[PDB]
Design a protein around this ligand. Structure first.
Ligand SMILES: [Cl-]
Ligand SMILES: [Cl-]
Ligand SMILES: [Mg+2]
Ligand SMILES: [Mg+2]
Ligand SMILES: [Mg+2]
Ligand SMILES: [Mg+2]
Lengths: 225, 243, 241, 195, 231, 250, 111, 204, 244
C-alpha cells in the first residue's frame, strides 16, 4: 500500500513495510520509500527488484544530469526517464511507482504504471491495498490541506491497507517534501503491529544438538614467517 | 605550406583552399542562370555543341526534384547529378513523414548541409558545382544558388559558370527596371537573351539553349521544360536583341 | 610540419588548426553585440547585402534554436547553419528525454563539448564559428552564453563578437563601470534594443539604416527577431532624443 | 469517449476523464486532450501508455519541424501520428483523433483508428463509448455551427456516451481552437447528467 | 604534380588528375566506332592481339536482348560496368516488366562512376564505353567516360586514333542517319568509318568485331567468318 | 566519411620520447597555476580564476569541480579538455562502481579510472592526448584523506602537497618549507592562500580565486534528513565571502 | 493467423518420346470453390528448348519459373552463350528449390 | 521442471550478540534420487559468508563468479570486501540477468570488520535484498524454516546458544522436507574466529 | 586522405628490426632500474623510484611493484600508465583461469598471455606498442619459484637473476659476478640492494627512493606469502645489510 498526497506548500508520500512471496511474509520491515534525488522520492509496488533497480538507475542518471546542468533535478525529468524506460520494456519490468518531490518549478505528484503510462493528481494510491487506501482518500481529502492534515490523511490511508489488505502490513513509512526545506524521511512513523511477548523461551540447553566434527576456519590471509 | 593538399584543412588565413579550388572547376563550366518572377521561377542553361554528332535536345542538363523544384548547375556535371540524387532522397523522406511537398527554403538547407558535410573531412572531395535551383511552394516563389562551400542565399536573379559576370550585369538591369516585378512569360524571354549575351564568353563553339520554369499561373506550380513554339519564340526574341 | 594540418600538439603545446578556425570567424566582416535587460536579452548584428541580386530577407546570421533560445553566429554561413541545425536537434532531444526546455547555458556547454571533440579527434575539423546563445532562462533569468572553436564557453553580462569586438567591448565595459550593475536597468525590451543600437553606433562610429541591422530579442517563454519596420521604429526613437 | 468537431470559427475537442483497469477506475480526472503544438491537439483512446508515448514523440517531431520549417499544418501532424501508428501497428493499441486550427485552412479534424489509416472528417468520434452515439451525432451534426452550438453538441453527445459506457465517465473536458487562442472548458456531472 | 596522388584532391586550377589519368588509359586502348540510323544502331570494334600466337581481345559485350556496349581501356573495368548494366536491365524486367531505357542506362553508369571520383581509397574506372540500344523511343547511341560524363550521339569513336573516324562520321552525318531498314549498309558505313583510324594494319577476319541492334533485331555480335562479308 | 584515422597519432621517436605527451605537458606548463595541500583532518585544492574578459561572468566558469560527494578536482592547462574529463569522470564513478557496489568509489580507484581514460587518448587511433594535468583531492572510509596528481600520459602520483602549471617550480619550493604532518585544515587553507598569491599578478580576492576543501561531513548540504548513516558531502566549495575573511588574517 | 500458402489447383503432365517431348497442363486457376481464370497459362517456354511448369501454389510457381528463366539468361552471359542442357537445368532447379528448404516453394515442378 | 526444486536444499542465517551463524544441509539430488551427501552450499570470500540454495549448477557457477569478483575487488581496493558491500554486489550481479535469471536463493552473512556490527541478508533470484535483523531463510523448506525461526529465535543470543537455536531450526525443518537433509553444517562466526560444525541428523 | 599522417608503427626496417619496438626499448632504458633475483627458498624483487620529492606521499604510493594474484607479482620499467593497462588485463586472465580450471594459473601461462598481447601491437592494428618491460616473480607447484621478463616486442625469457630499465648492462655484470645457485633469500635481498646501490644515478640509496618485495615459502607450512615492504621496513633492511 503506497500513497501520495499534495498539500499547501508541498507533497507527502507514505508506504507500508510488508514484503511477501505468495502467502509468506519475507520481510516484516521492508523499506518501500526510495530516494531518486535529495528532494525527489518515490514509492514502489509490484516486482520489488524491478522498483529498486529502476529507481537506482534513474537516480544515478538524475544525479549526473544535475551535475551536467548545474541545476537541481526536476520531478518531470525523473518521470520522463522512468516512463520511457518502462515503456521500452513493454511492462516486463513490473514497477508501479508513485513519484513525488519539490524542485524550482514547485511541488509535484505523479504515478507510473509498468507499461509506461503516467498520471497526475492531488492524491494517489498504488498496490494491492490501493482500493482500501483510495476509499479513505476519497472520503477525507479536501483542497488546501495543511502539512499536518496531509500526513494524517496519508498514514490513515496506509493503515486502511495494512488492516484490510493481506498483501500489506506491519509499519508505516512517510516522507515529507515541503517547498524551501529539506525533505524529512520518517522511517517507521507508525508502529501499530508489535509482536506480543512469547509465552515461553525456546533457548536450548548447551549440548542439546548432536555434533560429528569441529574445525577452525581460516578466514585470514596467508601469514608471514 | 601544404595546406591546400588536403580537404578540411584551415590555412593560416582561415581558408579552405580545396573548396576554393573546386570553385575553379565551376568557373570553368558552361553558363547557367535563374530568374525569379512574379509567381514563380525560370531556369536556363548554355549547352556547348562540341560536335555535329551530338543529338539535338537529347542531352538534357536541367533536372527536376520532386514535381515542383527545378535544378541546374555549372561545373562537373556528374557532381551535380549526385547532388540532385541526394536532393530527391531528401525530398522523398520529407514528403513521406510530413505529407506536404518539401518547401524550397527547407530543400535549400538539405542540399546546403550535404555540400557543407563534404568540407568537413579529408576522406572526401568538395563538390565541383554551383547549383541554381528553386520553385513554388505554399509561401510563393523562391530562387536559390548553392556554392561548393555549402554557402547559399535567396536570389532575385542568379548566374554561374564561365559567363557569370556578363549574366550578372544583365540580371542587375532587370531588377532596377522592374521593381514592381517581372511576369513568367517575360522571364523566359529575358532568360533566353541573357544566355545568348553570356555566350560571348564561349563564342568559339556554337551552343544549344535549354529553358525550364515553375509558375503558379502558367504551370500550376509544377516544373516543366519550355518546348516547341514557346522555346522558338524565346530564341527569336534572343536573336533579335543581339543583332 | 603536419602538426599544423590536423589537431595535434605543436612543440609549443599549441593547436594551430584551432587558431586558424578562430581567424575564419571574421571572414564575414560582421560585428555582433549582446546585452541583458531586466526582463529580456537583446542581440544585435550588422547586416550586409553587397549584391543587388540577393534576396535580402534570406540573408541572416541569427537563428531561432528553440522557442526560448536564440543564437547569433560569427563566421561563414555553411558552418553557421551546421551549428544551428545541430543545436536545434539537441534542444528538441533534450526536451523529449528530460521533460523540460533546454536551458541556454546547458545547450552552450553541449555545443562546446562537441567543439572540444573536434580539437581532439583528427578526422573532424573545427567549425570556424563563434556561437552566441541568448535567452531568458526560467531559473537564471536573462542569459548570454558564448562558444568558440576551442571548445571554450562562459556566461556574460554583455558581449561583442567580430572584427571590431574590442572597440565594442571597451564601450560596454565603460558603461557598466558607471552604472555598477550587471544589466541594463530598463523595463521594456524596446528601450534595451535602443540601448544596444546606440552603443554600437558610438563604438563603431557608423550610422545605421533599417536594412543595415539585424535584431533578435529574448523574452520570457519566447525568442523572436525584429522586422525591418520594427527596427526603423527603433531608429526613429533614437534620433528623436 | 472522445470527439472532435469543426465549426465556423475553428474546431473543438472533447473527452471524458475516466481511466480503467478492468472495472476499477484508476483515474477519474484524466486529461485525454493533449497538446502536440500550440494549436494542434489530439484526443487519445486505447492504451494510455501507447497513446502517451506516441503523443510525446509527435510533440518532439513538431517542435523540431517548427525550429527548421516554421509552423506545421494539421495535416502534417496527422501524418506523423499515422506513420507511428501504421509502422508499429502490431505492438500498438491507440485510437487517436487529431484536431488543429490554421488561419489558411481553419479548423480540421483527422481520425486515426487502430490500423493506422487516416480519415479527414467534419467531425469525429472514437473510444468505446462512441458506439452509443453514432446515431445521435449523425442526426444532430451540422456544418458551420456556432461555438455555443458546438459546445452543446459535444456536451450532449458525450453525456449519452458516458451514460451508457462503463469505461467512460467523470467530467467532460473540452478544448476550443480558434484564431482567438486556446480555451479550456470543463463540465461536471451535475451539469451534464440532467440533460 | 602534388595533386595527383589520389582522386579526392582537386588541383589549384580545379582539375582532377587521377580522373584525367584514367581518361588517358582509354586513348591507349584499341579503336572502336559507334553509329546509328532511325531503325538500327551499330558497333564496330578493332580487336587487339598480344602477338601472333595470341587471340584477339574481345571488345563487345552484350547487356540485354535490346542493349550492349563496346569497350576501350581496362577490360576488367568494362566487365564490372557491363555486369552492373546487366543487373540493372534485369531489375527493370523482373520488377517492372519493362525494358530499360538507354538514356536511363547512361544515367546509372554516370552515377556509378561518379562515386569512385569523390571518395578516398577507391579509384576511377579506367575504361570508356560505347552503348547502343533499341528501346521505346527508337535507336540510341551513348558515349561513356569514366569521369562520369555520358553523352547521347548520332555517331562517335573512342580509343587510339579515334579522331579520324569521328571526322568521317561528322561529314557522313546526313547520309548514314537516313540508312533505315538496311542493316548491311549501316555496317558498311561503320566499317568504312573505323578504316579512317587504321595505320599499317588492315581489317582481317579475326581482327574485326561488329555488333548490331534494331527494330526487329536483337543485340547480336559478329566475329570470325561472319564479318568476312564486310572486309 | 568514416573515421579513417585508426592509427596512433602518438608514437615513439628515435630518442624514446613520446612527442605528443611531452607537448601536452608543455601546454600544461603554460596553464594557470593550481595547487593542492593535504592536512590531518582535510584536503584543500585551489586555483586562480583567470577571467578572459571583465564582461564575462567568472562565476559561471567552474575550475574546481565536484566528482563525487567526497571527491573534488582542479586542473591546469586546457579548460575544455578538463570539462569533458570531469563529465567522463563523474559518469565512470557511477557505471564502473556505484551501480555495482552501491557506494561511491575511493579516491585512488576513481583516479585510476580517469588515468585510464587519459592513457587511452595517448595510444588509441586518431586522437591526441588530453592537454591537462589534474589534481584530485578526496576522502574515503578505509584510506582516509588523499591527494593525487594525474598527467597527460595517464601516470598518477599521490602527494602530501603539490602545485602544477605556470609557477609550479616556485610554488612547490614554497610548500616544502611550510608543510608538516601536524597541519590542521585551516592551516592548510592559510598556506594555500599564501602560496597562490605569489603566482597571481592582478587582483587577489574571493572573486578572482577559486578554492574548495575535502573536510568534515556537511549534513546541512545533504538536502534531506532521516537516515543516520548518510551524513552529507565532505566536498565543499568556499564562498567569495569565506575566502575574503581568511585574507584579512593573512 | 496468416497462412502464406494457397492452392490454385490445376494439373500437369509430361511425356517423353523417342525424339520429342510434351508438357501439358490445364488452363484453369482456382481458389476453394471459385474460378479465378479459365485461361491462365501454366506451362512456359524457358529458352534453350526447355519447357517448364510449377504446379500448386501459383505465386510460388510463377516465382520459380521467373527465377529459372533468369538462371538461363545468366548462364548465357557467364558461359559464352552455351546451351543449357536439360540435365544441367534439372540440377540448377534442384538448387533453386532446396535453397528454400525451410520455407518451401509449394509446387510440383516438371520440365 | 521447476528449477528451484530439482536438486533441493536449504540455508538459514541468524544474528546473535556480536556474532552471526549460517547453516545449510548437505543433500544434492535429482528429484527423488539422492546423489550426494557432501554438497555444501556455504562459501566464504574473506570474512564474508555466502549460502546459496536452488539449482546446483547455478550455485556452483555463482560461487566461482563471486570468488572471481571478490579477488579482483581485493587487488584493486587493497582490502577485503565487507558484507554490506558484498550484498550490493550480489544484487547487482543477479539483476543483470533479469530476463534469464540464476535459479538461486542466496544468503549473505558476516560481521563488519570496522564497525563490528553483525549483518545478514537474503535475496530473491533476481536481486531484491531482504535485510533482516533477526534471521534469513532460503530453500525448499523455507516455509518450515520460517516457522521454526520465528518461534525459536530471540535476540542477543550468545554464540554457544545461537548454535543450538539455528541447528534445531534447520534440523526440524529439513525433516519435514523430502528434498532437504542428508547431513548439515553450521558456521558460528565471531569477529576474529569461525567455528564449523557438522551435525548428526537422520539420513532419510 | 588520412594515409598522409600515418606513422606506420608495425613495419620492418631494411635491417629487419621493428622501429617502434626498438624506440620503446630506448624509452625503457631511461626508466628506474628494477631487479629480480631467484633463490632456492624464495624470490626477491627490488626497484628504484625515479627522482622523487620530499612532498611525495610514499606509504600510499605504488609505481614499480604490482600484485597480479596471491602467487605472482611484477616489477615495472617504463610508462606506468601503459603498465597498469596490462596489469589489469593480467589480473583478469589469472581469474579466468582460476574460474575455468579451479586452480591457480601457472606462472608461464600468465607471462605468455601478456607477451602475446604485446606481440599483437607490433604486428597489427597500427597502434604504438606498450612502452613497458616487466619482471615477473611467481610460484606454482610445477616449476616452483620462477623469474621471467617481457619487453615491448612480446618476447619473454626465464632467469635466475635479471635487471630491467636503466643501467642493466652494469647491473647484469654485478649480478653475474656474485650470484650462486645454492643462494638463499636473505643473501639475495643483500645482493639486490648492493647492485642498485652501485648502479644508481642518485648520490645515495635511501628508503624513500625504493620499492621492495619478496615471495617466500617462509609462510606457516607448505604455502607461499607475498610481502610488499613498507617504507619503515625498507629502512630497516637498508640498515641491516649495512648500506645506510
Ligand atoms: Cl556533452
Ligand atoms: Cl492518460
Ligand atoms: Mg581535427
Ligand atoms: Mg459511465
Ligand atoms: Mg528429508
Ligand atoms: Mg529419503
Amino acid at each position: 500500500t503506497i500513497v501520495g498526497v499534495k498539500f499547501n506548500n508541498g507533497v507527502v508520500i507514505a508506504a507500508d513495510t510488508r514484503s511477501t512471496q505468495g502467502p509468506i511474509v519475507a520481510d516484516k520491515n521492508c523499506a518501500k520509500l526510495h530516494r531518486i534525488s535529495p528532494k525527489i522520492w518515490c514509492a514502489g509496488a509490484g516486482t520489488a527488484a524491478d522498483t529498486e533497480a529502476v529507481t537506482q538507475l534513474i537516480g544515478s542518471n538524475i544525479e549526473l544530469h544535475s551535475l551536467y546542468t548545474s541545476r537541481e533535478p526536476r520531478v518531470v525529468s525523473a518521470l520522463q526517464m522512468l516512463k520511457q524506460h518502462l515503456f521500452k520494456y513493454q511492462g516486463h519490468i513490473g514497477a508501479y511507482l508513485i513519484v513525488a518531490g519539490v524542485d524550482p518549478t514547485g511541488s509535484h505528484l505523479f504515478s507510473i504504471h509498468a507499461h509506461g503510462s503516467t498520471d497526475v493528481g492531488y492524491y494517489l494510491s498504488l498496490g494491492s491495498g490501493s482500493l482500501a487506501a483510495m476509499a479513505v482518500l476519497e472520503s477525507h481529502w479536501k483542497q488546501d490541506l495543511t502539512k499536518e492534515e496531509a500526513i494524517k490523511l496519508a498514514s490513515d490511508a496506509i493503515q486502511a491497507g495494512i488492516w484490510n489488505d493481506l498483501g500489506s502490513g506491519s509499519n508505516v513509512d512517510v516522507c515529507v517534501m515541503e517547498i524551501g526545506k529539506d525533505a524529512e524521511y520518517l522511517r517507521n512513523y507508525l508502529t501499530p503491529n508489535v509482536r506480543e511477548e512469547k509465552q515461553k523461551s525456546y533457548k536450548f540447553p548447551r549440548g542439546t544438538t548432536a555434533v560429528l566434527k569441529e574445525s577452525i576456519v581460516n578466514i585470514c590471509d596467508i601469514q608471514e614467517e | 605550406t601544404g595546406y591546400d593538399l588536403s580537404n578540411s584543412v584551415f590555412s593560416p588565413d582561415g581558408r579552405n583552399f580545396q573548396v576554393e579550388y573546386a570553385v575553379k572547376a565551376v568557373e570553368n563550366g558552361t553558363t547557367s542562370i535563374g530568374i525569379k518572377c512574379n509567381d514563380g521561377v525560370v531556369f536556363a542553361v548554355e549547352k556547348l555543341i562540341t560536335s555535329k554528332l551530338l543529338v539535338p535536345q537529347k542531352n538534357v542538363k536541367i533536372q527536376v526534384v520532386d514535381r515542383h523544384i527545378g535544378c541546374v548547375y555549372s561545373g562537373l556535371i556528374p557532381d551535380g547529378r549526385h547532388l540532385v540524387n541526394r536532393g530527391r532522397e531528401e525530398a522523398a523522406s520529407f514528403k513521406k513523414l510530413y505529407k506536404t511537398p518539401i518547401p524550397i527554403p527547407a530543400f535549400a538547407d538539405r542540399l546546403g548541409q550535404y555540400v557543407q558535410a563534404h568540407t568537413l573531412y579529408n576522406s572526401v572531395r568538395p563538390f565541383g558545382v554551383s547549383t541554381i535551383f528553386g520553385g513554388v511552394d505554399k509561401n510563393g516563389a523562391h530562387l536559390y544558388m548553392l556554392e561548393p562551400s555549402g554557402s547559399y542565399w535567396g536570389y532575385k536573379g542568379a548566374a554561374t559558370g564561365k559567363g557569370r559576370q556578363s549574366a550578372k550585369a544583365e540580371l542587375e538591369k532587370l531588377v532596377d527596371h522592374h521593381p514592381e516585378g517581372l511576369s513568367a512569360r517575360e522571364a523566359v524571354k529575358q532568360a533566353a537573351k541573357i544566355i545568348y549575351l553570356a555566350h560571348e564568353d564561349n563564342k568559339e563553339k556554337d551552343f544549344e539553349l535549354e529553358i525550364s520554369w515553375c509558375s503558379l499561373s502558367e504551370t500550376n506550380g509544377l516544373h516543366k521544360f519550355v518546348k516547341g513554339d514557346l522555346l522558338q519564340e524565346a530564341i527569336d526574341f534572343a536573336q533579335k536583341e543581339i543583332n | 610540419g603536419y602538426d599544423r594540418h590536423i589537431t595535434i600538439f605543436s612543440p609549443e603545446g599549441r593547436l594551430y588548426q584551432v587558431e586558424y578556425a578562430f581567424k575564419a570567424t571574421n571572414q564575414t566582416n560582421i560585428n555582433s553585440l549582446a546585452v541583458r535587460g531586466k526582463d529580456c536579452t537583446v542581440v544585435i548584428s550588422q547586416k550586409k547585402v553587397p549584391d543587388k541580386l540577393l534576396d535580402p530577407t534570406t540573408v541572416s546570421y541569427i537563428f531561432c534554436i528553440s522557442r526560448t533560445i536564440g543564437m547569433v553566429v560569427n563566421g561563414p554561413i555553411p558552418d553557421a547553419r551546421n551549428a544551428a541545425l545541430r543545436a536545434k536537434a539537441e534542444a528538441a532531444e533534450f526536451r523529449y528525454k528530460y521533460g523540460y526546455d533546454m536551458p541556454c547555458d546547458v545547450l552552450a556547454k553541449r555545443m562546446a563539448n562537441l567543439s572540444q571533440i573536434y580539437t581532439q579527434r583528427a578526422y573532424m575539423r573545427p567549425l570556424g564559428v563563434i556561437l552566441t546563445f541568448v535567452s531568458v532562462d526560467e531559473e537564471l533569468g536573462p542569459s548570454i552564453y558564448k562558444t568558440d572553436p576551442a571548445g571554450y564557453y562562459v556566461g556574460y553580462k554583455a558581449t561583442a563578437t567580430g572584427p571590431k569586438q574590442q572597440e565594442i567591448t571597451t564601450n560596454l565595459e565603460n558603461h557598466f563601470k558607471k552604472s555598477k550593475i550587471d544589466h541594463i536597468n530598463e523595463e521594456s525590451w524596446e528601450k534595451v534594443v535602443e540601448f544596444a543600437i546606440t552603443h554600437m553606433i558610438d563604438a563603431l562610429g557608423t550610422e545605421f539604416s533599417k536594412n543595415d541591422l539585424e535584431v533578435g530579442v529574448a523574452t520570457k517563454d519566447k525568442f523572436f527577431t525584429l522586422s525591418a519596420e520594427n527596427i526603423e521604429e527603433r531608429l526613429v526613437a533614437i534620433a528623436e532624443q | 469517449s472522445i470527439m472532435a468537431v469543426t465549426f465556423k470559427d475553428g474546431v473543438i475537442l472533447g473527452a471524458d476523464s475516466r481511466t480503467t483497469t478492468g472495472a476499477y477506475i484508476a483515474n477519474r480526472v484524466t486529461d485525454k486532450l493533449t497538446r502536440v503544438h500550440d494549436k494542434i491537439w489530439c484526443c487519445r483512446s486505447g492504451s494510455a501508455a501507447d497513446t502517451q508515448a506516441i503523443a510525446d514523440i509527435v510533440q518532439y517531431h513538431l517542435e523540431l519541424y517548427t525550429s527548421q520549417y516554421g509552423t506545421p499544418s494539421t495535416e502534417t501532424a496527422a501524418s506523423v501520428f499515422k506513420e507511428l501508428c501504421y509502422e508499429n501497428k502490431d505492438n500498438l493499441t491507440a485510437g487517436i483523433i487529431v484536431a488543429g486550427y490554421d488561419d489558411k485552412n481553419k479548423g480540421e479534424v483527422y481520425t486515426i483508428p487502430l490500423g493506422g489509416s487516416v480519415h479527414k472528417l467534419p467531425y469525429a468520434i472514437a473510444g468505446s463509448g462512441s458506439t452509443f452515439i453514432y446515431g445521435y451525432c449523425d442526426k444532430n451534426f451540422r456544418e458551420n455551427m456556432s461555438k455555443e452550438e458546438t459546445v452543446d453538441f459535444i456536451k450532449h453527445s458525450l453525456s449519452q456516451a458516458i451514460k451508457w459506457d462503463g469505461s467512460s465517465g467523470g467530467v467532460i473536458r473540452m478544448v476550443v481552437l480558434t484564431a482567438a487562442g486556446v480555451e479550456r472548458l470543463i463540465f461536471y456531472p451535475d451539469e451534464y447528467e440532467q440533460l | 604534380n602534388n595533386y595527383d596522388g589520389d582522386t579526392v584532391t582537386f588541383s589549384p586550377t580545379g582539375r582532377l588528375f587521377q580522373v584525367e589519368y584514367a581518361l588517358e588509359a582509354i586513348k591507349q586502348g584499341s579503336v572502336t566506332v559507334g553509329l546509328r540510323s532511325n531503325t538500327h544502331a551499330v558497333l564496330v570494334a578493332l580487336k587487339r592481339n598480344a602477338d601472333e600466337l595470341s587471340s584477339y581481345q574481345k571488345k563487345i559485350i552484350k547487356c540485354d536482348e535490346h542493349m550492349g556496349l563496346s569497350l576501350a581501356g581496362l577490360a576488367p573495368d568494362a566487365r564490372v560496368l557491363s555486369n552492373y548494366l546487366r543487373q540493372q536491365c534485369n531489375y527493370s524486367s523482373l520488377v517492372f516488366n519493362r525494358k530499360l531505357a538507354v538514356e536511363r542506362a547512361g544515367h546509372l553508369l554516370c552515377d556509378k562512376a561518379q562515386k569512385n571520383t569523390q571518395s578516398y581509397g577507391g579509384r576511377p574506372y579506367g575504361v570508356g564505353l560505347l552503348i547502343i540500344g533499341y528501346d521505346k523511343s527508337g535507336a540510341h547511341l551513348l558515349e561513356f567516360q569514366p569521369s562520369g560524363n555520358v553523352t547521347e550521339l548520332y555517331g562517335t569513336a573512342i580509343g587510339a586514333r579515334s579522331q579520324g573516324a569521328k571526322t568521317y562520321l561528322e561529314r557522313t552525318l546526313d547520309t548514314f542517319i537516313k540508312i533505315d531498314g538496311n542493316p548491311d549498309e549501316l555496317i558498311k558505313a561503320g566499317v568504312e568509318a573505323i578504316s579512317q583510324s587504321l595505320r599499317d594494319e588492315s581489317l582481317t577476319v579475326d581482327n574485326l568485331s561488329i555488333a548490331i541492334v534494331g527494330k526487329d533485331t536483337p543485340f547480336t555480335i559478329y566475329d570470325g567468318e561472319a564479318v568476312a562479308k564486310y572486309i | 566519411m568514416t573515421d579513417r584515422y585508426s592509427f596512433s597519432l602518438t608514437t615513439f621517436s628515435p630518442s624514446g620520447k613520446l612527442g605528443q605527451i611531452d607537448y601536452a605537458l608543455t601546454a600544461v606548463k603554460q596553464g594557470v597555476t593550481s595547487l593542492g595541500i593535504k592536512a590531518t583532518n582535510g584536503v584543500v585544492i585551489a586555483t586562480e580564476k583567470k577571467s578572459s574578459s571583465p564582461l564575462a561572468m567568472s562565476e559561471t566558469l567552474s575550475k574546481v569541480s565536484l566528482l563525487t560527494p567526497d571527491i573534488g578536482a582542479v586542473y591546469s592547462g586546457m579548460g575544455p579538455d578538463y570539462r569533458v574529463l570531469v563529465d567522463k569522470s563523474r559518469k565512470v564513478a557511477h557505471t564502473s562502481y556505484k551501480r555495482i557496489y552501491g557506494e561511491y568509489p575511493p579516491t585512488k580507484l576513481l583516479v585510476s579510472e580517469v588515468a585510464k581514460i587519459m592513457q587511452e587518448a595517448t595510444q588509441s587511433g586518431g586522437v591526441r592526448p588530453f592537454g591537462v594535468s589534474l589534481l584530485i583531492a578526496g576522502h574515503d572510509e578505509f584510506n582516509g584523506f588523499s591527494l593525487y596528481q594525474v598527467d597527460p600520459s595517464g601516470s598518477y602520483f599521490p602527494w602530501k602537497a603539490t602545485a602544477i602549471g605556470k609557477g609550479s617550480v616556485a610554488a612547490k619550493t614554497f610548500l616544502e618549507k611550510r608543510w608538516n604532518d601536524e597541519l590542521e585544515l585551516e592551516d592548510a587553507i592559510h598556506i594555500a592562500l599564501l602560496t597562490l598569491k605569489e603566482s597571481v599578478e592582478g587582483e587577489f580576492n574571493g572573486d578572482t580565486i577559486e578554492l574548495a576543501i575535502i573536510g568534515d561531513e556537511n549534513p546541512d548540504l545533504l538536502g534531506y534528513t532521516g537516515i543516520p548513516t548518510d551524513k552529507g558531502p565532505r566536498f565543499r566549495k568556499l564562498t567569495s565571502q569565506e575566502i575574503n575573511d581568511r585574507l584579512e588574517a593573512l | 493467423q496468416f497462412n502464406p500458402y494457397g492452392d490454385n489447383g490445376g494439373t500437369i503432365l509430361g511425356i517423353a518420346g523417342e525424339d520429342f517431348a510434351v508438357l501439358a497442363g490445364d488452363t484453369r486457376n482456382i481458389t476453394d470453390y471459385s474460378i479465378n481464370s479459365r485461361y491462365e497459362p501454366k506451362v512456359f517456354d524457358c529458352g534453350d528448348n526447355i519447357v517448364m511448369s510449377a504446379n500448386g501454389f501459383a505465386a510460388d510457381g510463377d516465382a520459380l519459373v521467373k527465377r529459372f528463366k533468369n538462371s538461363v539468361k545468366w548462364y548465357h552471359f557467364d558461359h559464352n552463350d552455351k546451351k543449357l542442357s536439360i540435365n544441367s537445368a534439372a540440377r540448377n532447379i534442384q538448387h533453386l528449390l532446396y535453397g528454400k528448404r525451410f520455407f518451401p516453394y509449394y509446387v510440383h515442378t516438371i520440365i | 521442471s521447476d528449477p528451484s526444486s530439482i536438486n533441493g536444499g536449504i540455508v538459514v542465517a541468524m544474528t546473535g550478540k556480536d556474532c552471526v551463524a549460517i547453516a545449510c544441509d548437505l543433500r544434492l539430488g535429482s528429484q527423488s534420487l539422492g546423489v550426494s551427501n557432501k554438497f555444501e552450499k556455504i562459501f566464504h570470500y574473506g570474512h564474508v559468508f555466502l549460502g546459496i540454495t536452488g539449482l546446483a549448477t547455478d550455485v556452483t557457477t555463482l560461487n566461482e563468479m563471486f570468488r572471481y569478483k571478490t579477488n579482483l575487488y581485493k587487488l584493486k581496493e587493497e582490502r577485503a570486501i565487507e558484507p554490506e558491500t558484498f550484498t550490493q554486489l550480489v544484487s547487482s550481479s543477479l539483476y543483470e540477468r533479469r530476463f534469464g535469471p540464476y535459479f538461486v536463493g542466496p544468503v549473505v552473512a558476516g560481521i563488519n570488520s570496522k564497525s563490528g556490527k553483525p549483518f545478514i541478508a537474503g535475496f530473491d533470484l533476481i536481486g531484491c535484498i531482504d535485510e533482516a535483523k533477526d534471521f534469513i531463510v532460503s530453500g525448499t523448506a523455507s516455509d518450515q524454516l520460517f516457522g521454526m525461526c520465528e518461534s525459536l529465535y530471540e535476540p542477543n543470543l550468545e554464540p554457544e546458544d545461537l548454535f543450538e537455536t539455528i541447528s534445531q531450526a534447520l534440523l526440524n525443518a529439513a525433516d519435514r522436507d523430502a528434498l532437504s537433509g542428508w547431513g548439515a553444517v553450521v558456521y558460528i562466526i565471531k569477529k576474529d574466529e569461525v567455528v564449523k560444525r557438522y551435525l548428526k541428523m537422520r539420513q532419510d | 586522405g588520412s594515409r598522409r599522417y600515418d606513422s606506420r608503427t608495425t613495419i620492418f626496417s631494411p635491417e629487419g628490426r621493428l622501429y617502434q619496438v626498438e624506440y620503446a626499448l630506448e624509452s625503457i632504458s631511461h626508466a628506474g632500474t628494477a631487479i629480480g633475483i631467484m633463490a632456492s627458498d624464495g624470490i626477491v624483487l627490488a626497484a628504484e623510484r625515479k627522482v622523487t620529492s620530499t612532498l611525495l606521499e610514499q606509504d600510499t604510493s605504488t609505481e614499480k611493484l604490482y600484485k597480479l594474484n596471491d602467487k605472482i607479482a611484477v616489477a615495472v620499467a617504463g610508462l606506468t600508465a601503459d603498465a597498469e593497462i596490462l596489469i589489469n588485463t593480467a589480473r583478469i586472465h589469472a581469474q579466468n583461469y582460476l574460474k575455468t580450471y579451479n586452480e591457480d594459473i601457472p606462472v608461464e601461462i600468465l607471462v605468455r598471455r601478456l607477451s602475446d598481447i604485446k606481440q599483437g601491437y607490433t604486428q597489427h592494428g597500427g597502434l604504438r606498442p606498450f612502452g613497458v618491460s616487466f619482471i615477473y616473480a611467481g610460484y606454482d607447484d610445477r616449476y616452483g619459484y620462477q623469474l621471467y621478463t617481457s619487453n615491448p616486442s612480446g618476447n619473454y625469457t626465464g632467469w635466475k637473476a635479471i635487471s630491467v630499465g636503466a643501467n642493466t648492462s652494469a647491473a647484469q655484470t654485478l649480478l653475474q659476478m656474485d650470484y650462486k645457485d645454492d643462494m638463499k633469500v636473505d643473501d639475495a635481498i643483500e645482493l639486490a640492494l648492493k647492485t642498485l646501490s652501485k648502479t644508481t644515478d642518485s648520490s645515495a640509496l635511501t628508503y624513500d627512493r625504493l620499492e621492495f618485495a619478496t615471495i617466500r615459502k617462509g609462510a606457516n607450512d607448505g604455502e607461499v606469502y607475498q610481502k610488499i615492504f613498507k617504507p619503515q621496513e625498507i629502512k630497516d633492511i637498508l640498515v641491516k645489510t649495512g648500506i645506510t
